Design a protein around this motif. Structure first.
Motif, short mmCIF file in Angstrom:
data_model
loop_
_atom_site.label_atom_id
_atom_site.label_comp_id
_atom_site.label_asym_id
_atom_site.label_seq_id
_atom_site.Cartn_x
_atom_site.Cartn_y
_atom_site.Cartn_z
N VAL A 20 0.80 -1.32 0.04
CA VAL A 20 0.06 0.02 -0.05
C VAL A 20 0.67 1.20 0.12
N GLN A 21 0.28 2.35 -0.48
CA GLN A 21 1.18 3.50 -0.86
C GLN A 21 0.10 4.71 0.05
N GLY A 22 0.89 5.46 0.79
CA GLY A 22 0.27 6.48 1.59
C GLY A 22 0.59 7.79 1.00
N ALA A 25 4.47 11.73 4.58
CA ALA A 25 5.65 11.15 5.11
C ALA A 25 5.48 9.53 4.85
N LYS A 26 4.32 9.13 4.56
CA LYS A 26 4.30 7.78 4.43
C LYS A 26 3.72 7.63 2.84
N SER A 27 4.61 8.17 2.10
CA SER A 27 4.56 8.52 0.60
C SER A 27 4.84 7.52 -0.27
N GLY A 28 5.49 6.40 0.17
CA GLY A 28 6.03 5.46 -0.54
C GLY A 28 5.26 4.15 -0.43
N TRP A 29 5.65 2.96 -0.66
CA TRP A 29 4.86 1.56 -0.79
C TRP A 29 5.61 1.04 0.51
N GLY A 30 4.81 0.18 1.06
CA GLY A 30 5.11 -0.47 2.33
C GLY A 30 3.87 -1.44 2.43
N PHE A 31 4.25 -2.43 3.49
CA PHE A 31 3.23 -3.56 4.15
C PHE A 31 2.01 -2.72 4.82
N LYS A 33 0.09 -1.79 7.90
CA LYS A 33 0.55 -2.09 9.34
C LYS A 33 0.31 -0.62 10.02
N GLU A 53 -6.60 -0.31 5.90
CA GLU A 53 -5.76 0.07 5.02
C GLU A 53 -5.93 -0.49 3.58
N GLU A 98 -5.79 8.41 3.88
CA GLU A 98 -4.39 7.90 4.25
C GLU A 98 -3.78 7.22 3.24
N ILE A 99 -4.60 6.58 2.49
CA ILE A 99 -3.95 5.35 1.24
C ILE A 99 -4.45 5.90 0.06
N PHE A 131 11.29 1.79 0.14
CA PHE A 131 12.07 1.90 1.57
C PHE A 131 11.52 1.06 2.73
C1 LEY Z 1 8.43 6.76 1.97
C2 LEY Z 1 8.83 6.78 3.37
C3 LEY Z 1 9.35 8.28 3.88
C4 LEY Z 1 7.67 6.16 4.60
N1 LEY Z 1 7.98 6.26 5.97
C5 LEY Z 1 6.86 5.55 6.13
C6 LEY Z 1 6.17 5.06 5.23
C7 LEY Z 1 4.88 4.22 5.12
O1 LEY Z 1 4.58 3.63 6.07
N2 LEY Z 1 4.26 3.87 3.96
C8 LEY Z 1 3.43 3.07 3.72
C9 LEY Z 1 2.13 3.03 4.52
C10 LEY Z 1 1.73 2.02 5.48
C11 LEY Z 1 0.58 2.05 6.03
C12 LEY Z 1 -0.42 3.16 5.87
F1 LEY Z 1 -1.39 3.29 6.63
C13 LEY Z 1 0.11 4.16 4.79
C14 LEY Z 1 1.29 3.91 4.14
N3 LEY Z 1 6.99 5.42 3.90
#
Ligand code: LEY
Length: 149
Positions: A20-22, A25-31, A33, A53, A98-99, A131
């Motif tokens: 998922v991509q937020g 600050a959470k702009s990249g891709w991650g699992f 959580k 999510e 958020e997503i 990341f």
């Molecule tokens: C790119 C980098 C700066 C960064 N830091 C934290 C995140 C991150 O968690 N992104 C995935 C994500 C997970 C859960 C969610 F609800 C929304 C997005 N990415």
């Protein structure tokens, strides 16, 4: 740091994982959580965050001993491994504030480390939109080898 819990969802072939991509600050891709609530059990936090999510309820599929856990700067992140989820599952966040997006990615094409900048004689790592996923990719590959082979 408050522990986080989520899931590594794989498809039926075991080739692909769900990221998922937020935003911001959470702009990249991650699992998928998120942070455990007070008194909340790890399995319930994982299901809640994954459901918020992705729209997909993992509660019936979580196996208690099938997870990957990493401590990153003194914060624990545990992701329960959830194989066999069909690639045509319709995923829809509760929270599109958020997503941004939800996608399948090929495991063998995801990086398991960021690239250095030694072409530029500069220290550190190049930015990588994966990341947040990266630290789990080698342990997940090693875990699928042991569990399935
Ligand atoms: C790119 C980098 C700066 C960064 N830091 C934290 C995140 C991150 O968690 N992104 C995935 C994500 C997970 C859960 C969610 F609800 C929304 C997005 N990415």
């Amino acid at each position: 740091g408050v522990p986080t819990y989520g899931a590594i969802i794989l498809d039926e072939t075991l080739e692909n994982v769900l990221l998922v991509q937020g935003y911001l600050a959470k702009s990249g891709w991650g699992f998928p959580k998120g942070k455990v609530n007070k008194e909340e059990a790890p399995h319930d936090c994982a299901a809640r965050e994954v459901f918020e999510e992705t729209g997909f309820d993992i509660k019936d599929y979580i196996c208690k001993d099938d997870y990957i856990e990493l401590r990153i700067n003194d914060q624990l992140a545990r992701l329960y491994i959830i194989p066999g989820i069909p690639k045509d599952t319709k995923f829809n966040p509760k929270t599109r504030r958020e997503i941004r997006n939800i996608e399948w990615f090929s495991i063998e094409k995801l990086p398991c480390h960021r690239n250095d900048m030694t072409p530029k004689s500069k220290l550190g790592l190049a930015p990588n939109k994966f990341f947040m996923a990266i630290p789990f990719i080698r342990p997940l590959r090693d875990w699928l080898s042991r569990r399935f082979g």
